[PDB]
Design a protein around this nucleic acid. Sequence first.
RNA 1: GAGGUGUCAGAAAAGUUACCAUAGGGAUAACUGGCUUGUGGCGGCCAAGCGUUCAUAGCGACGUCGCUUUUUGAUCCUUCG
RNA 2: AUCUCUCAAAUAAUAACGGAGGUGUCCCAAGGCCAGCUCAGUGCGGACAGAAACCACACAUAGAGCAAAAGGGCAAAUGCUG
RNA 3: GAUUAGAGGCCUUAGGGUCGAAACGAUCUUAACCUAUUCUCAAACUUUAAAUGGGUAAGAACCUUAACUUUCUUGAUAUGAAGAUCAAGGUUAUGAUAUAAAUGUCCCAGUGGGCCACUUUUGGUAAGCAGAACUGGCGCUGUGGGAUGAACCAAACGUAAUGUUACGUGCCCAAAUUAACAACUCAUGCAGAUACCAUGAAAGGCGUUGGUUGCUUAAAACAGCAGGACGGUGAUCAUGGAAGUCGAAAUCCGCUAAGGAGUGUGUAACAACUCACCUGCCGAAGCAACUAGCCCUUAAAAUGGAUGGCGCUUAAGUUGUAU
RNA 4: GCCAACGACCAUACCACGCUGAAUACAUCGGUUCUCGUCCGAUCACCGAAAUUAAGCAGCGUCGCGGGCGGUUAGUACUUAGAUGGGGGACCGCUUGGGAACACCGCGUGUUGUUGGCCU
Lengths: 182, 290, 75, 158, 217
Amino acid sequence: MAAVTKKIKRDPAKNPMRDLHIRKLCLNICVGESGDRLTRAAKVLEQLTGQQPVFSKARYTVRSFGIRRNEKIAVHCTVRGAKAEEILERGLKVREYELRRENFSSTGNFGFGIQEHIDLGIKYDPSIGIYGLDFYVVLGRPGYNVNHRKRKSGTVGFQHRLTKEDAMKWFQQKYDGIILNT
Amino acid sequence: KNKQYFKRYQVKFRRRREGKTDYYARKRLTFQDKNKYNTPKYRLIVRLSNKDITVQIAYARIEGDRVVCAAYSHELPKYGIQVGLTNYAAAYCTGLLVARRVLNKLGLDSLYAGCTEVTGEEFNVEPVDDGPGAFRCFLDVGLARTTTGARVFGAMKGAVDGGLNIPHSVKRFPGYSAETKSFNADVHRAHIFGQHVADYMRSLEEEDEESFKRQFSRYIKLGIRADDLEDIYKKAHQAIRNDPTHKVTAKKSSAVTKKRWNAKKLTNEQRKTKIAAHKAAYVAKLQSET
Amino acid sequence: AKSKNHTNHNQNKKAHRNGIKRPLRKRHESTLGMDVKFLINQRYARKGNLSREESVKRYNERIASQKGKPKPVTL
Amino acid sequence: TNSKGYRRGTRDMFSRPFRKHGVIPLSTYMRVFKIGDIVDIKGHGAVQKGLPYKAYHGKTGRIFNVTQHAVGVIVNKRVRGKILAKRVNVRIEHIHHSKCREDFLRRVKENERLLKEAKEKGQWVSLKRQPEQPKKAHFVKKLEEPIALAPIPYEFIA
Amino acid sequence: GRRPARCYRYCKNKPYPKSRFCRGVPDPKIRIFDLGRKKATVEDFPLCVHLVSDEYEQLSSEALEAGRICCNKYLVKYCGKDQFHIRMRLHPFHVIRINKMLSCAGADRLQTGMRGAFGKPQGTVARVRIGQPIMSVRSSDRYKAQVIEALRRAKFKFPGRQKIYVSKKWGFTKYERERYEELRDDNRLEPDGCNVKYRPEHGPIAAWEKAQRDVYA
RNA sequence: GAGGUGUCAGAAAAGUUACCAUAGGGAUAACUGGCUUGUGGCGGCCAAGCGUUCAUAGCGACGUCGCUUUUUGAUCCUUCG
RNA sequence: AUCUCUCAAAUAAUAACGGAGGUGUCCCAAGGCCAGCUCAGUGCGGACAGAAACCACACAUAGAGCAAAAGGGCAAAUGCUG
RNA sequence: GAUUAGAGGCCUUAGGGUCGAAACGAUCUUAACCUAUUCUCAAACUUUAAAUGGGUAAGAACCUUAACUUUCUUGAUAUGAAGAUCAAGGUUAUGAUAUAAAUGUCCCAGUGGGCCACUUUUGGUAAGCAGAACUGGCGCUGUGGGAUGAACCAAACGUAAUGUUACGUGCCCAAAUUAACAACUCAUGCAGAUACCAUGAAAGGCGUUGGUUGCUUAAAACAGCAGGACGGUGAUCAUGGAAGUCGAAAUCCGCUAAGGAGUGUGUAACAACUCACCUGCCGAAGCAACUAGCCCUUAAAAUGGAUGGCGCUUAAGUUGUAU
RNA sequence: GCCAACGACCAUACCACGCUGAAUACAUCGGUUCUCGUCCGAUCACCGAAAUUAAGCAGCGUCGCGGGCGGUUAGUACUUAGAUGGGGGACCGCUUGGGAACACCGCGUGUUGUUGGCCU
């Protein structure tokens, strides 16, 4: 606001550092039960990711479906680096990756539901059955650790914060999928 | 939204807004007992950065902390430490440095020679009798998690091997395995001599040349092979005990108002002339169509 | 019955009749309930006050044993 | 039909100010306090470790015993009516430094010095305070816009 | 039960507030405070006339119900059915406690000798000070006779003594009538429901700019 | 240290008397007098009205303001030799 | 017997069978301490997914929580988890 | 924490719909929601924050200077601290007060029912009731004044002379019917008359005395006694008549100094009929809405009766003052 | 004119947005063998530098929000104190003194300490 822009020639404000790197992929299964209905969903993820997953205890007893405080209804696991970008393209062929428009949170994040989890390069294994999955991919830029450190922390700004268009271009650019603007 | 938010909101302090101090160690460190009225605390700051660690001895006061002495790892290329300035072993010699950069101020150089043969045992100093009791200090790490063998404790290990009486245990020195302790002193003699940085190279001498195009590059720019790192770090210990010259500087000066530089702040007159034309420009944008 | 339970009339006319009686100004005061040494230290310095005229000069000559005190200005 | 007990009617003695909540600023622990010093008591509402009672907040008195992190002050409490000398321990943030001596201690310097410059001229001291006298006889010119300037009312119509 | 207010004519206590657990209190129908063309803008009704009091009177709310339905039913007779704005400037936000002898059925046998002395709630009241207007009628300047005579018939339902200002205001504004126009005539005042806008300058530019846009183009 | 006095600075304790008693009490009720008015009883201001029409011949809604104290109470001033 | 806000009239004190409530317990952690993390809620997203949960990113001055009444108090805690 | 009123809004929360099969094209509407306002408040609400207040200080028991002391817990001057002796210090450190103050014992007697009052205040509808905060009184206290009285206003009291004072001076009743004043006020069953205090309302009143605003008037106003007053148009609204006229949509004008689709009796038609208006007439101020002084009305209780009494009415009443 | 560490008072420092930032720096940033922690080397932990000044951060801009200050609302509101002052009452007036508050208008946008350091 009334500050002289004047464009001192160091860069055209291109991307030397705004390079839009995928931060992480987090997985979750929300199945309203426990027991074998839990741990078979647990042994989905240990072979699907290679990380030992963590469960999640429910927040409050809702009694519309009888889930209880500390009942461990749900399983979730996170993936950072060298495994996100292979799991997602596995998840995109089953997605036939022209994925619908939202699917796109305004903070530059995008996730999607899938069904029929066998087609992620795994055997059917009728001992465990089928399990419906939700995916969620969080993207970032080089620099977001400034938000998440203990010492001299701080927020980022108008940009490097990711707009939704930063998440739709980058999905249109690589992986070549259209966004299905319905 | 968020407008009478601002009338009631008040701010956490300054250095909880920057995220620098914590004010829950700051009260509890610098507290002296209020009957030993004004004899200060003399704690020991250790702050570390991406480039260069920092160790200052200080005691707080009403008007900001006084500082008796400070020693950085950037001084170390005098004493032969050219690269690798944030090792644990590079953190060792800095805490060794102030523990001899400060006893010259007190003249405590005849007494408290310290652990002259460093090997990794907790040789807290002894009060040499009939006179000067040993210098006292307490560790202030502040905002780093005190995990078992962090870089900040070699700086402490520099000081207690320098000769400063600091109470400490060993449970955050490296290699003292808490399953189960394992007073294994010798892993210091591999760490304070920096050798596991070298043995990282000796376990990477053979796999990738690009590993040397990766991390511990520029040892290759100075020919620093993975064999003589102790011989650097042994030589520093006898050379830091030569002369902490306290970094005297006699530029004196090129400092004053060069060149302007930082966009002075527009008094109300030229503020008003900015608004006077802007209101005149907007009717000029309106008088254009009519 | 109930006429007058708990009033303050005539209560500061009484308290200002044999009047309001400031405490004291005592030169020395009781050290009863002070820090208990502290006071054993001052009970040790009270005994060792031995020099009025004699040794009180003499230790300056002992300062000159280090030709004075150039060094200890720091701690 | 009561008060009783020990912290009743302290919705405003130990309320915090407008937006001075939070971490106590760390100079409060750094002040030096001596024995025989004079001191005030404003019970700090965010520190529960030995607040003064409500009958001593507002009251000044002399320190006479200092400890690790509290101070034993002597506060005059009026009872009926024989004023007692109490012996109160409080912590540090329930204490401030008085200023009531601070002006006098700069009056002792200057009356030592207004006699010190008058040590050489000799005469004369004029040390003690005076309350406000009448001013003097002046005369003042208009000099500057002669009179009237004349206020005369018209104060109702409304 | 519908207690008279010969017994409740003064500010006898520091005023009772309205709690948030005592539900069971009587629901009044004093819900109406503005009457007339309440939707008309400032340009439609420029005359404003108050009914200013002369004591620290405490008004009942029975009187304020009558003081609005009196002045409606001359101004829907002698002013035209929309040419005004009756407004109560004064809300009855207090409680009166009535310890009455509902001491029939004759065999409780402890009822009160002086045991106990709880109060019992049966309505509201509205407290007034000197120079505090109770109603204001915003209308057009033509019915000036019709409104100052409408408020005389609102006096005789209120206790106390009232005085009838015709304002130098331009309706319900804070502004003087001539001083309204001078500030109005270029950009500086903006229309609203029944009021105006006050120096939209600071800040920062576009509110100065866009309000200068539409007055230009 | 514990076992508990909650009437909580701490006796171990059911009623009745119209068959009654004593010491007293106007420190205390029933009774007159006094003060008081929720109740009792009460007449002006302003008119929405009714009054076929017509406001006020006669009444007069919501208001509002005053008046009496033999009742009803409210109190406990006076009196319990 | 006892506690909290009000009465209470800007020290503290103050009364009525005045007003609104509380107590006779509860806790081997709900006590201690060191470390880590931040809450009410709202906003955009994600198979079965509304009020449905759960994962997820931003906002979030305490509008949460702190055994219990009420009042103060607390944000790298006194809160949550270890 | 209650809370009135509307304004603005992409809205997509949208309710009716609507143009539309629905609209997903769009239209407004209505509900919220959001934005900038707005009316009124709060013993158990606060950003701000008085007066009256509460605390402490105001010098020799002071001010510095020194080196000594200590076992110590803290410290390399074996520094700090708290002290023990020396060195320097002007004129003693706001004002005004001192009927003497300080301190023991006998905690010796009595008391541990209080009432009244300003301002504050809670319960009650009120109370000469109930309960508190402050100061002063009564209790214990006479005298002067209020005719009268526990507390009001003056004043506190040894026996006397003289002189001089808050309330009063028409007579009871000492001293003014003032060789002092201006005004206000007529009161036919209570004129009014010494603060507390001995009850009184709202609203009036062409009773009277002042006022503030608004007119009209010397181109002669108001007041009283003359003239004209319909038609274009039974165009028109109204048929219980409309024709100017119970009630009128309209709607001007023509005529003309002055006549309007018209002013009048609880006159259904025409019409009679009169006002408005103008000029004649006379010619100095006039008309109205207010406002607050005293007076009045409101204003009604039981033995006979109370400005204290008589009486007073250019006062012996009331307001402002003087000797 | 700066930078880092450590602060003090703790918004004139905060928030939103936009621009700039020489050097010293700080960061961002590369890795997981060790120490070390994690479901996940993101967080911490440890190793050391290729990249970058984008962002943090620093400096500024805005009739910005807020917050700070001053005038002014105002000798106002309220209030000590006094009257055998007014009024039927509410309440008011006078005398003697103390004397605010929102709003409103303006004006400022952190000041600094100790220690090393850069010098456009």
